[PDB]
Amino acid sequence: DSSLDNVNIGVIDNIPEIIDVNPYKENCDKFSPVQKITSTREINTNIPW
Amino acid sequence: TIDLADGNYVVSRGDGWILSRQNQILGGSVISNGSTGIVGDLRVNDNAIPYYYPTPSFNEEYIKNNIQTVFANFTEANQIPIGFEFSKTAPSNKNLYMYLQYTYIRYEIIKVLQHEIIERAVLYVPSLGYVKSIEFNPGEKINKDFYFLTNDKCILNEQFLYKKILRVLPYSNGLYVINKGDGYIRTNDKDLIGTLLIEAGSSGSIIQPRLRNTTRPLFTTSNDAKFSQQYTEERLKDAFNVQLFNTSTSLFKFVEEAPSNKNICIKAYNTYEKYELIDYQNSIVNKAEYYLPSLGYCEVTNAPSPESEVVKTQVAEDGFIQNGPEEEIVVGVIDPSENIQEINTAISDNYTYNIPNNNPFYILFTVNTTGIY
Structure with missing residues (x-):
């Protein structure tokens, strides 16, 4: 219960907003969608589960 | 004791105030044997934070909002x-000492009652600097008034601006863009870069180095329908080829060298250029006003008026004043709604074009040889 103690809200509220930004040319690489396939097994039995 | 009515007020004592005892904190410079010394600063950050001195009636938010609404917005x-800079040249055989301090704009919010002030909240907004110089010889005794200040004062002219708190146009049906000139400034010193007092023999300088390219163009339309910031910007790009609207990389700097027997006061403002986007049809039907930032304006007071009396004055109604030359450049523009069909072949004598429903349209053409058609 002492992890966020060092944060000072007032100072943050006193920060001026960013107006002019000097951009880095290559800051985005690409997006790789994740495709997944779910298997399905058949476990025959005689003792009810 | 004020002569106004009861209630609250917003007061602007003006620019050119120097606080008390904060004289030599920034340090000084010593020059000798005909050398030249230039000091200066850049009011950017860690030095552009206003100082608030409020009263229970008037808190910080109240003061900030009230002053920013009426007077210059300092938060933006x-x-x-x-940047500002003072330059000074020492004599052939002597020593010179020159020290720098900051000048602040002073705003007051007051609560008058029975012609007597019963409250006063003060805001000091850093604006520019002031350099005090003296030629000396070893062992000389300097008046204490030269270094130390016991009370705040206005080196510039005092002021008490306040505001109580509550022809035939022979054109054709179509669009037009009118450039009305350069050097537009809002009233009440709302677009003031700042004021500099140059002592005799020195040379002040005010520079906008465009260290940050941002700008604050102003837009005002009589009908949000069919008109908008994007629409007017596109129309201007079509007309005047304006590429950058809220950006700029052009610097403007003003330098004044005061004579050897007087003091000068130079005021620097940000300027604007006015573009009117009319929609004349048969009688103006619509109008828009675009104020594109220009490269500033400089006024030179030869000297402050002799101290006679601080005559109270009220703020002028919100508006604009033009200081540059008067002009009216009119440029037609293609209405984007209408379609334009381009003819891939140059037109010779005795040509025919097949109209290809009831809406107006455009056709673009060029002749093969100069002549009357």
Whole structure:
């Protein structure tokens, strides 16, 4: 219960907003969608589960 | 004791105030044997934070909002660097000492009652600097008034601006863009870069180095329908080929060298250029006003008026004043709604074009040889 103690809200509220930004040319690489396939097994039995 | 009515008020004592005892904190410079010394600063950050001195009736938010609404908005300007510099030349055989301090704009909010002030909240907004110089010889005794200040004072002219708190146009049906000139400034010193007092023999300088390219164009339309910031910007790009609207990389600097027997006061403002986007049809039907930032304006007071009396004055109604030359450049523009069909072949004598429903349209053409058609 002492992890966020060092944060000072007032100072943050006193920060001026960013107006002019000097951009880095290559800051985005690409997006790789994740495709997944779910298997399905058949476990025959005689003792009810 | 004021002569106004009861209630609250917003007061602007003006620019050119120096606080008390904060004289030599920034340090000084010593020059000798005909050398030249230039000091200066850039009001950017860590030095552009206003100082609030409120009273229970008037808190910080109240003061900030009330002053920003009527007078110059300093919160936005706190991020755009502005630089100033004083230069001074020492004599052939002597020593010179020159020290720098900051000048602040002083705003007051007051609560008058029975022609007597019963409250006063003060805001000090850093604006520019002031350099005090003296030629000396070893062992000389300097008046204490030269270094130390016991009370705040206005080196510039005092002021008490306040505001109580509550022809035939022979054109054709179509669009037009009118450039009305350059050097437009809002009233009440709302677009003031700052004021500099140059003592005799020195040379002040105010520079906008464009260290940050941002700008604050102003837009005002009589009908949000069919008109908008994007629409007017596109129309201007079509007309005047304006590429950058809220950006700029052009610097403007003003330098004044005061004579050897007087003091000068130079005021620097930000300027604007006015573009009117009319929609004349048969009788103006619509109008828009675009104020594109220009490269500033400089006024030179030869000297402050002799101290006679601080005559109270009220703020002028919100508006604009033009200081540059008067002009009216009119440029037609293609209405984007209408379609334009381009003819891939040059037109010779005795040509025919097949109209290809009831809406107006455009056709673009060029002749093969100069002549009357």
